[PDB]
Amino acid sequence: STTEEQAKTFLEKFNHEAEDLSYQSSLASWNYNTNITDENVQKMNEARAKWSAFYEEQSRMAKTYSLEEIQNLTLKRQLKALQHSGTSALSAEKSKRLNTILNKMSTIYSTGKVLDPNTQECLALEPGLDDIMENSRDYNRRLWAWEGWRAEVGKQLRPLYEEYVVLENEMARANNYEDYGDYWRGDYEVTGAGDYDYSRDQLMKDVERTFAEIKPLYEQLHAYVRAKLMHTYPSYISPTGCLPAHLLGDMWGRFWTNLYSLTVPFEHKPSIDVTEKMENQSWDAERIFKEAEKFFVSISLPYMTQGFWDNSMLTEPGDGRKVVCHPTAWDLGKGDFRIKMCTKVTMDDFLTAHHEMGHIQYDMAYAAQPYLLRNGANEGFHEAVGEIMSLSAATPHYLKALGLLAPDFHEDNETEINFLLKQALTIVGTLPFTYMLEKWRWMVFKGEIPKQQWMEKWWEMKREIVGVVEPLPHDETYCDPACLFHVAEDYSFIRYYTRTIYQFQFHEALCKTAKHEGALFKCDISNSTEAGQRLLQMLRLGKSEPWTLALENIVGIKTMDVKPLLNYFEPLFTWLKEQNRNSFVGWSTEWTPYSD
Amino acid sequence: TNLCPFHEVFNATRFASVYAWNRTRISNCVADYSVLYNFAPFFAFKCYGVSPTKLNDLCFTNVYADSFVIKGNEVSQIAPGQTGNIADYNYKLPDDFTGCVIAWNSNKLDSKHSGNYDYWYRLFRKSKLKPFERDISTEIYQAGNKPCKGVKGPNCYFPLQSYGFRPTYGVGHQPYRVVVLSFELLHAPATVCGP
Numbered sequence: 001s002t003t004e005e006q007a008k009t010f011l012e013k014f015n016h017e018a019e020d021l022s023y024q025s026s027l028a029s030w031n032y033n034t035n036i037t038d039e040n041v042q043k044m045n046e047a048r049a050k051w052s053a054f055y056e057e058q059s060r061m062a063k064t065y066s067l068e069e070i071q072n073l074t075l076k077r078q079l080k081a082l083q084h085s086g087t088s089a090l091s092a093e094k095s096k097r098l099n100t101i102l103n104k105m106s107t108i109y110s111t112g113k114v115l116d117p118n119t120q121e122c123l124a125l126e127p128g129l130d131d132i133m134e135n136s137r138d139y140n141r142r143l144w145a146w147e148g149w150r151a152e153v154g155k156q157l158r159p160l161y162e163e164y165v166v167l168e169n170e171m172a173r174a175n176n177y178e179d180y181g182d183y184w185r186g187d188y189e190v191t192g193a194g195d196y197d198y199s200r201d202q203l204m205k206d207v208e209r210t211f212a213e214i215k216p217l218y219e220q221l222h223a224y225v226r227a228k229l230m231h232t233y234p235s236y237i238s239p240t241g242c243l244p245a246h247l248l249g250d251m252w253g254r255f256w257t258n259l260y261s262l263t264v265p266f267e268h269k270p271s272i273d274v275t276e277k278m279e280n281q282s283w284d285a286e287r288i289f290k291e292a293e294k295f296f297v298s299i300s301l302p303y304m305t306q307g308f309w310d311n312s313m314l315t316e317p318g319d320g321r322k323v324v325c326h327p328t329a330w331d332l333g334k335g336d337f338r339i340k341m342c343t344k345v346t347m348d349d350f351l352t353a354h355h356e357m358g359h360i361q362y363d364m365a366y367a368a369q370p371y372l373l374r375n376g377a378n379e380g381f382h383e384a385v386g387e388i389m390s391l392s393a394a395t396p397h398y399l400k401a402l403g404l405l406a407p408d409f410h411e412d413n414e415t416e417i418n419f420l421l422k423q424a425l426t427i428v429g430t431l432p433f434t435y436m437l438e439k440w441r442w443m444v445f446k447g448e449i450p451k452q453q454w455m456e457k458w459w460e461m462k463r464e465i466v467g468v469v470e471p472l473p474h475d476e477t478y479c480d481p482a483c484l485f486h487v488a489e490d491y492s493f494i495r496y497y498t499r500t501i502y503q504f505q506f507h508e509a510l511c512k513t514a515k516h517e518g519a520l521f522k523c524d525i526s527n528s529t530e531a532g533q534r535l536l537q538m539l540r541l542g543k544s545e546p547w548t549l550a551l552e553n554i555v556g557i558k559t560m561d562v563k564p565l566l567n568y569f570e571p572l573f574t575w576l577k578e579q580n581r582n583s584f585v586g587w588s589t590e591w592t593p594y595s596d
Numbered sequence: 597t598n599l600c601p602f603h604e605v606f607n608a609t610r611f612a613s614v615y616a617w618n619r620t621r622i623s624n625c626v627a628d629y630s631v632l633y634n635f636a637p638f639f640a641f642k643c644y645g646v647s648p649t650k651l652n653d654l655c656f657t658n659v660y661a662d663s664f665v666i667k668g669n670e671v672s673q674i675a676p677g678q679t680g681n682i683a684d685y686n687y688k689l690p691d692d693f694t695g696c697v698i699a700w701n702s703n704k705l706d707s708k709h710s711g712n713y714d715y716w717y718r719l720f721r722k723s724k725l726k727p728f729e730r731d732i733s734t735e736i737y738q739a740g741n742k743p744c745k746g747v748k749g750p751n752c753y754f755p756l757q758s759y760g761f762r763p764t765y766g767v768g769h770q771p772y773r774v775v776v777l778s779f780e781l782l783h784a785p786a787t788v789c790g791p
């Protein structure tokens with residue numbers, strides 16, 4: 001009458017019997033995203049229905065086995081995931097209504113149009129209205145064209161989200177939680193290990209300390225952007241103050257890349273554009289990732305299996321099939337590794353291929369781990385690991401080595417300054433907005449503010465740390481944060497904040513072992529077999545051991561810091577300080593634009 | 597010399613599960629092991645006991661053969677004196693067995709589209725399989741205080757599981773036909789001796 005062998009045998013049977021139901025369920029989805037038609041969706045749903053029921057019925061029997069008697073740590077780590085249930089905790093009504101609410105939010109975000117101009121011009125949200133937002137140069141046009149989304153979709157989605165908050169507040173507390181914020185933060189908690197313990201309350205302090213050391217760079221960049229935008233758009237945007245909500249390229253202000261044309265460091269000079277060197281010298285789609293596989297081999301990593309070059313789709317359909325292609329890299333299960341991507345000859349496809357191959361190699365690295373541990377250490381490792389090598393492959397040294405750049409080329413100061421600013425506009429432009437959104441979400445899930453003051457506090461305390469002002473007031477009739485797709489579909493936003501920090505620490509730690517002397521923004525990791533082994537040590541670890549042990553293995557520092565991130569942008573800060581000598585850095589929140 | 601089983605035991609159409617191997621006793625025959633090279637490009641030919649150089653001129657009393665169909669990761673598990681999940685519950689080899697092991701890949705025949713469910717491998721077993729031991733009859737494994745009462749449910753599972761075989765699996769999960777050849781010594785006038 002053993003008390004732990006029972007758990008061991010149950011886990012063994014689950015592991016050995018859950019692979020057949022999952023491989024053929026994933027293959028149905030793969031066949032769906034290669035020829036969309038009536039039969040393929042039917043097959044995908046039919047295969048997913050066979051696994052949803054199995055997963056819902058295995059948890060009910062895994063819950064019986066206690067988590068206190070069990071002693072072996074790698075058994076509790078696997079059993080904890082299966083013990084935790086999902087939406088199958090609320091009663092019949094609270095789930096048959098929650099599912100309906102979620103579907104209604106998805107539908108109402110999907111459907112939307114505005115009619116600002118003559119009746120015939122009822123431009124929908126995408127792609128015409130998005131294009132005119134990201135390309136126009138005006139004030140009245142943008143204002144009267146995108147007052148629609150924050151005043152119609154927001155009004156549509158107020159009551160449903162108001163009900164959703166109180167309906168899902170009493171869903172986490174069923175699973176022994178304080179509020180939904182605890183459920184969201186539980187993805188990082190690791191307990192039961194000595195000297196490796198990270199509570200939910202510690203992550204808040206970690207984020208609040210991490211955000212404090214990036215303020216000088218953001219303030220300097222904000223001052224530079226404001227100074228340029230005063231010159232570009234006249235009679236508006238007061239010389240000292242905050243930026244308007246619109247006018248910043250993308251609507252929600254997540255990215256700042258579309259303002260690159262507005263703000264360029266040094267004009268009359270060309271950036272590195274390796275697209276004609278790939279055109280005059282003929283180069284097809286196969287070699288585009290064949291050379292990437294060559295690079296992965298050069299960093300001393302295993303080759304790609306033959307079960308990848310026969311079946312994976314790597315170009316335009318070209319045979320009458322209708323498929324919507326976005327760059328992904330599937331992991332079908334038992335030994336299968338496939339990549340689907342529409343390839344065209346530019347840098348964007350090249351770097352995207354590098355990213356997808358990097359993270360599919362990460363997926364292949366931990367293939368030996370059981371089914372319940374075939375994932376990254378945390379939810380932010382895959383994207384950061386993939387992006388590290390895309391960043392490392394963008395250097396001019398590696399490009400010259402591959403033969404794409406002229407041998408008789410010397411990297412000028414202006415070109416490297418432009419490259420640094422182009423990366424900064426997209427990297428540091430998302431950090432304070434992501435932190436803003438996640439802080440507001442957490443603070444509203446905890447119920448700190450009343451439900452009668454939802455948008456007033458949102459705008460007032462966004463104008464403080466993001467420093468973006470909003471034209472005209474919104475007196476609790478306009479659900480503003482609902483415009484984002486991630487908020488409407490209930491997706492996590494912390495991953496994007498921590499991914500940048502993780503990748504910037506990983507880059508420095510990896511290139512210190514590669515023995516590169518000089519600047520960090522032109523550092524390259526190739527022909528570095530020992531560095532490849534150091535990285536593979538972390539990659540092969542999997543999720544068996546707590547992510548901070550992986551952090552210590554790859555780097556050696558338990559906590560996460562921004563000093564590696566600040567090392568990359570030191571020349572940018574040094575130059576920008578010299579550029580700003582007659583301007584006043586700061587976003588004193590006193591002026592408003594809605595003064596009639 | 598006359599249609600010895602050394603070829604007719606490899607070209608068989610349907611093989612057996614790993615727990616019901618078809619042992620064959622090799623009668624009087626000549627031990628020409630260099631003609632097996634004319635049957636397929638084998639994947640594994642390494643073999644223990646006697647170095648292959650000396651195998652040209654040797655003689656023994658009787659030779660026994662066993663046939664399986666197994667995955668790829670478990671090919672290295674059939675080596676003597678190893679521990680695992682198939683080498684200790686379905687087929688265990690003696691530590692000092694003086695025979696040879698041959699295995700070759702068969703994925704264009706053993707794997708069908710939409711899955712082929714005709715092979716099995718045991719997973720649950722109370723004791724440990726002694727070297728050269730077999731058992732085919734299954735019983736509902738007792739993994740609980742409550743008696744199984746001949747049925748499944750809580751703590752009572754089914755040992756045998758079907759080998760999932762698909763034509764798109766990686767090299768790791770490709771079916772591999774396996775034949776194990778072992779030599780025996782007695783105190784009788786020997787029958788099989790090499791040329």
Ligand SMILES: *[C@@H]1O[C@H](CO)[C@@H](O)[C@H](O)[C@H]1NC(C)=O
Nearest residue numbers: 031034035037039040319321
């Ligand atoms: C298109 O659909 C057919 C349905 O018969 C199926 O073979 C597959 O999903 C697609 N075929 C090709 C060649 O893309």
Ligand SMILES: *[C@@H]1O[C@H](CO)[C@@H](O)[C@H](O)[C@H]1NC(C)=O
Nearest residue numbers: 008011071072073074075076
């Ligand atoms: C937990 O069990 C596994 C086998 O499933 C074993 O390899 C591991 O060593 C055990 N944990 C410890 C701490 O020994």
Ligand SMILES: *[C@@H]1O[C@H](CO)[C@@H](O)[C@H](O)[C@H]1NC(C)=O
Nearest residue numbers: 298397398401402524526527
């Ligand atoms: C790696 O070494 C080879 C040696 O021939 C060299 O050609 C290649 O450019 C190197 N890769 C780099 C420097 O990225």
Ligand SMILES: *[C@@H]1O[C@H](CO)[C@@H](O)[C@H](O)[C@H]1NC(C)=O
Nearest residue numbers: 265266412413414415417575
């Ligand atoms: C780049 O460095 C050179 C080094 O002499 C200097 O002359 C030039 O002014 C610099 N350009 C900048 C900092 O934009």
Ligand SMILES: *[C@@H]1O[C@H](CO)[C@@H](O)[C@H](O)[C@H]1NC(C)=O
Nearest residue numbers: 608610611612613618619620
């Ligand atoms: C066992 O061997 C006998 C004699 O060769 C053969 O006829 C029979 O079919 C074999 N079993 C299997 C699984 O084919």
Ligand SMILES: *[C@@H]1O[C@H](CO)[C@@H](O)[C@H](O)[C@H]1NC(C)=O
Nearest residue numbers: 603604606607608634635636
């Ligand atoms: C197996 O049988 C087929 C048909 O007789 C024959 O062509 C083949 O040569 C045999 N296998 C060997 C010994 O390679």
Ligand SMILES: [Cl-]
Nearest residue numbers: 245252253468
């Ligand atoms: Cl805004």
